[PDB]
């Protein structure tokens, strides 16, 4: 096939309003407004075009591991070492709290205005009803702490990665495990869904990525190198699924080629670890945060 | 008016100091996730004790990468679990994310150790102090300090202390050791080294 070739991108905007390290970020469905979370107990909603802070929310607990943006744009969420999921209304008032987990909250994703899916470090996931504020289902297959999750485009399934070198697929309606994949040697840090919804990618501490196809039930590609001896903190796909972007602990992000599986680019502009990484809904820009307290937008 | 509030909160942020509290169940670290706040000489310290999680710490420990110091409490009167505490300290010291963080080591329960001595490790036979209680105290301290000095000489330092149950000077010690840590940082930051 025709290789992608060198992929050169440069920082367009830089967002500087956070005091501590960035731990998570998420984009809005409008492809303009994004929410980011910092360990200094602040939740800022930015404007990429102008870099103006639309909002700023002080959180009760300083250590937040994740944040989410409602697909309708009327709410947000976040959580961490407090073992709660806090949901804020954007009429900003704390509208609710979801408290059923036992370990720290690792990830969360809105299904609707009324439902949200969460994972915790107690090795379980759960589906909530926001109006009633109680769990509806639990998913209890994993053996190690769940680190990431990713909702399917139809919103009827999802995959989760755990600190056991394995992944699993769940039926939201049925609440039963469908499959299991074991290709890695150490903890899984990130997981993503391919645009078509029939695959996913995974980054681990053994310093490799791998691509799993649900129908074949086996790892297809293995994105590694002989000189990379660090783990992977985040992954993300592009609009077409042709470039896989992965952040590392070497302070740089690499732009892999999902099919040819040979690195095609690098984004070296952060002085510390690259923690979070997201791609816009309409595929126009890429945002990356780091432990340097700065957010950068690349095009 | 977001910018003014953010500037004020940034000014507030660097004024206070964070701490992480570590230890075992038998170590009376609670009397030395909960939040504690105290003040010495008009400087504010915030100490955090994490107890709502499972017994695997290799992932949520990374949240405390940029803390000022770590407080490690040891129950020194129990010979059985002393090797477990040594292994815990060795794991903490050599972590990649805690390589720049200084450790304040508290060797608690000194009265119990004295009582036990007056009533595991074979190298204690050919040991001499740098009277039995003094030898045991410094033997355990040096057991920890061998691990401390075996690596990471330039980057960070370990401050040892002997603590009893009725001690009331722990806050002063944390204040002084944090002052020294900050002096090291300023030394490296103002072109002096």
């Amino acid at each position, epitope marked *: 096939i025709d290789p992608v070739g060198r992929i050169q991108m440069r920082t367009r905007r830089t967002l500087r309003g956070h005091l501590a390290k960035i731990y998570a970020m998420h984009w809005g469905t409008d492809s303009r407004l994004l929410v980011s979370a910092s360990q200094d107990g602040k939740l800022i909603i930015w404007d990429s075009y102008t870099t103006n802070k639309v909002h700023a929310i002080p959180l009760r607990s300083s250590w937040v591991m994740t944040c989410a943006y409602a697909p309708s744009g009327n709410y947000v969420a976040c959580g961490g070492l407090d073992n709660i999921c806090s949901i804020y209304n954007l009429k900003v008032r704390v509208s609710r709290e979801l408290a059923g987990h036992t370990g720290y909250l690792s990830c969360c994703r809105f299904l609707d205005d009324n439902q949200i899916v969460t994972s915790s470090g107690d090795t379980t996931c759960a589906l909530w009803d926001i109006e009633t504020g109680q769990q509806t289902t639990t998913f209890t297959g994993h*053996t*190690g702490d769940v680190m990431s999750l990713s909702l399917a485009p139809d919103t009827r399934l999802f995959v989760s990665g755990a*600190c*056991d*070198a394995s992944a699993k697929l769940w039926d939201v309606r049925e609440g039963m495990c469908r499959q299991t994949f*074991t290709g890695h*040697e*150490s*903890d899984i840090n990130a997981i993503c869904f391919f645009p078509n919804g029939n695959a996913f990618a995974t980054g681990s*501490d*053994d*310093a490799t990525c791998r691509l799993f196809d649900l129908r074949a039930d086996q790892e297809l590609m293995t994105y590694s190198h002989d000189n990379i*001896i660090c*783990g992977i903190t985040s992954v993300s796909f592009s609009k077409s699924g042709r470039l896989l972007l992965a952040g590392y602990d070497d302070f740089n992000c690499n732009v892999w080629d999902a099919l040819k599986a040979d690195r095609a680019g690098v984004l070296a502009g952060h002085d510390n670890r690259v923690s979070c990484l997201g791609v816009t809904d309409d595929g126009m820009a890429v945002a990356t945060g780091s432990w340097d307290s700065f957010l950068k937008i690349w095009n | 008016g977001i910018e003014k509030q953010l500037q004020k909160d940034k000014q507030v942020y660097r004024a206070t100091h964070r701490l992480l509290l570590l230890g075992a169940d038998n170590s009376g670290k609670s009397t030395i996730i909960f939040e504690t706040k105290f003040q010495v000489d008009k400087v504010n310290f915030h100490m955090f004790d994490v107890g709502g999680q499972r*017994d*695997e*710490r*290799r992932k949520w*420990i990374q949240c405390f990468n940029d803390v000022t110091a770590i407080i490690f409490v040891v129950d020194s009167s129990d010979y059985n679990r002393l*090797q*477990e505490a040594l*292994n815990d300290f060795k*794991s903490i010291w*050599n*972590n*990649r994310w805690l390589r720049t963080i200084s450790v304040i080591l508290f060797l608690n329960k000194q009265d119990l150790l004295a009582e036990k001595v007056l009533a*595991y*490790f*074979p*190298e204690f036979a050919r040991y001499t102090t740098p009277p039995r209680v003094t030898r045991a105290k410094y033997f355990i301290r040096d057991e920890f300090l061998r691990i401390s000095t075996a690596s990471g000489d330039g980057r960070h330092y370990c401050y040892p202390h002997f603590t009893c149950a009725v001690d009331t000077e722990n806050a002063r010690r944390i204040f002084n050791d944090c002052k020294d840590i900050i002096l090291q940082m300023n030394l490296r930051e103002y072109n002096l080294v």
Partner: nanobody
Amino acid sequence: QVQLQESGLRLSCAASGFTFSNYKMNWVRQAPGKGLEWVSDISQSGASISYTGSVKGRFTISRDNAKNTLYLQMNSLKPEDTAVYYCARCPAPFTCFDVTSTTYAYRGQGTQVTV
């Protein structure tokens, strides 16, 4: 899919599903009615070796990367050594936290040793 299978007095560990040489190995026992206790470790290349004081001078450890196996040459045992012995592999390569954990995912099923 990692898997550590032990056998065995000279104990031998069989490792599968990963590179053997880039990791630091350990020896973890579990005496009856007590928690898991660390015994011996050996670095990647087999240079640095450390022991619990109890088995100092008695148990000899050596790793064989070529055959991908770990040994604990033990002699002059005591009744206090009766326990289950597990083979542990702390997770990160090129570098050891949760080995003696209640539910650690990277250690074998173990072999019961009775003296």
